[PDB]
Design a protein around this ligand. Structure first.
Ligand SMILES: CCCCCCCCCCCCOP(=O)([O-])OCC[N+](C)(C)C
Ligand SMILES: CCCCCCCCCCCCOP(=O)([O-])OCC[N+](C)(C)C
Ligand SMILES: CCCCCCCCCCCCOP(=O)([O-])OCC[N+](C)(C)C
Ligand SMILES: CCCCCCCCCCCCOP(=O)([O-])OCC[N+](C)(C)C
Ligand SMILES: CCCCCCCCCCCCOP(=O)([O-])OCC[N+](C)(C)C
Ligand SMILES: CCCCCCCCCCCCOP(=O)([O-])OCC[N+](C)(C)C
Ligand SMILES: CCCCCCCCCCCCOP(=O)([O-])OCC[N+](C)(C)C
Ligand SMILES: CCCCCCCCCCCCOP(=O)([O-])OCC[N+](C)(C)C
Ligand SMILES: CCCCCCCCCCCCOP(=O)([O-])OCC[N+](C)(C)C
Ligand SMILES: CCCCCCCCCCCCOP(=O)([O-])OCC[N+](C)(C)C
Ligand SMILES: CCCCCCCCCCCCOP(=O)([O-])OCC[N+](C)(C)C
Ligand SMILES: CCCCCCCCCCCCOP(=O)([O-])OCC[N+](C)(C)C
Length: 10
């Protein structure tokens, strides 16, 4: 999921 990748960046 895309949000999980954002979460990973942040
Ligand atoms: C107006 C604001 C726009 C902000 C845009 C920010 C960039 C977003 C980049 C998102 C990249 C991640 O995509 P993803 O889930 O791996 O893609 C789906 C890939 N498959 C179909 C193979 C599963
Ligand atoms: C309504 C539009 C808002 C736009 C502004 C951006 C807000 C981003 C907030 C993102 C907060 C992180 O959420 P999360 O803990 O992973 O999600 C919990 C729910 N699920 C488990 C189903 C994913
Ligand atoms: C779905 C797209 C998401 C894009 C990413 C958005 C990230 C937004 C992060 C917002 C975090 C808010 O932190 P807060 O509690 O107010 O602390 C901040 C406190 N100071 C100002 C003193 C440093
Ligand atoms: C901002 C933070 C939100 C946190 C909650 C995330 C919940 C994720 C739910 C995921 C399912 C939502 O699929 P939808 O939009 O109906 O798909 C429509 C797709 N097409 C346009 C290709 C048909
Ligand atoms: C308006 C400008 C928009 C620019 C958007 C450019 C696309 C960005 C896609 C970012 C995808 C990041 O997540 P991921 O590939 O799962 O991370 C894997 C881990 N590393 C990042 C350390 C390699
Ligand atoms: C995924 C990494 C990015 C995280 C982005 C965090 C955005 C914070 C927005 C704070 C301002 C809006 O306050 P609220 O309506 O009570 O916010 C509820 C937000 N959460 C569901 C995440 C608790
Ligand atoms: C796939 C989603 C793409 C959209 C992401 C939206 C979030 C805002 C852009 C963040 C992209 C850069 O993050 P990064 O330099 O790796 O982390 C921040 C730097 N530290 C790790 C040192 C804290
Ligand atoms: C609307 C604007 C949306 C912008 C979304 C941008 C998402 C892509 C961020 C790419 C920023 C460049 O990362 P880099 O130095 O090559 O990776 C450093 C990664 N670590 C910190 C984990 C080591
Ligand atoms: C649609 C246009 C939106 C423009 C605004 C985007 C705001 C993005 C705010 C990005 C806030 C950066 O937080 P950060 O230091 O990486 O936090 C996480 C720190 N740790 C990794 C140590 C937990
Ligand atoms: C970009 C900032 C990432 C901060 C990461 C460090 C966590 C501690 C600071 C929490 C600040 C308030 O966060 P909130 O409104 O309850 O959202 C929570 C959304 N995440 C669960 C995805 C973080
Ligand atoms: C090619 C695409 C380019 C996308 C560019 C995305 C930019 C994302 C910005 C991420 C900012 C993360 O802040 P940081 O490293 O933890 O600094 C925080 C340091 N102070 C507390 C002293 C201010
Ligand atoms: C007119 C309305 C104006 C509202 C303006 C709101 C500005 C909020 C600024 C929020 C800056 C985000 O936090 P930061 O410094 O990147 O820390 C990221 C890491 N922590 C969440 C743990 C602190």
């Amino acid at each position: 999921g895309l949000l999980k990748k954002i979460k990973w960046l942040l």
